[PDB]
């Protein structure tokens, strides 16, 4: 399985996987930005907001694609716990351009460190690696077994039904909710791609693994 970081440096567990309400709301974020109330700041402030957005997409990007890997919450929560610390500085240096740039470089590092720890736990769970790949396999099989198949979105559980239909007997599909969840996600991708939207290719590590070779 292709990792986000090829030779992962060992990852640490802080046992923070059960934390909830770690994601900052838009109101909370806006209160932080409103502290940067100066013309000289406005330019970099825009850069800052972009990073936070990228940051959020990166975090959920991991949960959407790897919720099957146990340590996924740990990695996700550690990201937002660290981000909470960066904001302590932001709140004290709201108009310090250089420091705001530094905070931006730190968010990248945080993301990079998450990609690293992710690649590490995946490289410690061959089982998961196989099952993930099998899902990309069974989803590719779906790219064909759906050519002219009728797919009605706006109606209940069409996806899981089409998954239970095409593979409802597979041991993994039967015992692993996370395996099923990847398959269903795939049916939405197969359709959305076939409807003139190659954007899907680079929307996630799953979409990228399925729409290639």
């Amino acid at each position: 399985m292709k990792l986000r970081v090829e030779n992962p440096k060992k990852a640490q567990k802080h046992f923070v996987q059960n934390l909830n309400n770690v994601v900052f709301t838009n109101k909370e974020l806006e209160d932080i930005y409103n502290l940067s109330n100066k013309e000289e700041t406005k330019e970099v402030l825009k850069l800052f907001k972009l990073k936070v957005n990228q940051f959020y997409r990166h975090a959920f990007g991991i949960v959407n694609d790897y919720n099957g890997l146990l340590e996924y919450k740990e990695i996700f929560n550690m990201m937002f716990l660290k981000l909470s610390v960066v904001f302590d500085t932001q709140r004290k240096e709201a108009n310090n351009v250089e420091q705001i740039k530094r905070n931006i470089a730190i968010l990248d590092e945080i993301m990079a460190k998450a990609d690293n720890d992710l690649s590490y736990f995946i490289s410690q769970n061959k089982n998961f690696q196989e099952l993930w790949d099998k899902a990309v396999k069974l989803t590719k099989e779906m790219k064909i077994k759906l050519k002219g198949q009728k797919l009605d979105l706006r109606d209940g559980e069409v996806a899981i039904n089409k998954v239970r239909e095409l593979f409802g007997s597979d041991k993994n599909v039967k015992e692993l909710w996370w395996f099923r969840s990847l398959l269903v996600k795939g049916v939405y991708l197969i359709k959305r791609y076939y409807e003139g939207d190659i954007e899907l290719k680079t929307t996630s590590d799953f979409a990228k693994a399925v729409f290639e070779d």
Partner: T-cell receptor
Amino acid sequence: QSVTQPDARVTVSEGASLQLRCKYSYSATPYLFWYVQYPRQGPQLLLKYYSGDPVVQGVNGFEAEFSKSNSSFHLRKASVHRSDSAVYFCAVSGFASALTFGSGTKVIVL
Amino acid sequence: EAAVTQSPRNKVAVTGEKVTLSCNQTNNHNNMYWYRQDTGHELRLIHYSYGAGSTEKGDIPDGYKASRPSQENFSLILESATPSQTSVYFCASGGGGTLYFGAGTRLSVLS
């Protein structure tokens, strides 16, 4: 208020044509949706725009155009069947895949 | 049976009472949301969850607490009900781009 709807309540005599106005704000990689909610019910997917053909091919003779230019996602239908007397909400997808709905326009077909 | 199953359908609570709303989704979806809609307005999310064990705050969490004990259930909790909470609540499911809402629940806080 990423998305905005200026039309509170728009009434149109049956058979006619209707156009619900919707302009967003995310102005980046908009994931625009339209939802319809008939009385005593919960919003239903009316039509959605991913990223491709700016003209969204909805259902029940519905269509919406995504003009990054005017940064709007207006909704319009050819003939306004009286079976369309309900409220309409346009919205955008969030970071956690949550929908942020607009004010909402109520349509009363005569 | 419904894809998204809310419950109860109607609820009348005395100001101060503890109210719990349930939501079931058999779509094998990971994401689940809770919105409240005041008559004549849009849906505003209270809390959301991206999987079992998870729960995050939405645009209007004050006064509410959510719980996601299993992949299929996401309940909304009202510790001490207040008149301002009188409204209609909708639950939603998600895994594929769009959100699949439920019937809705009418809650009235008296006193």
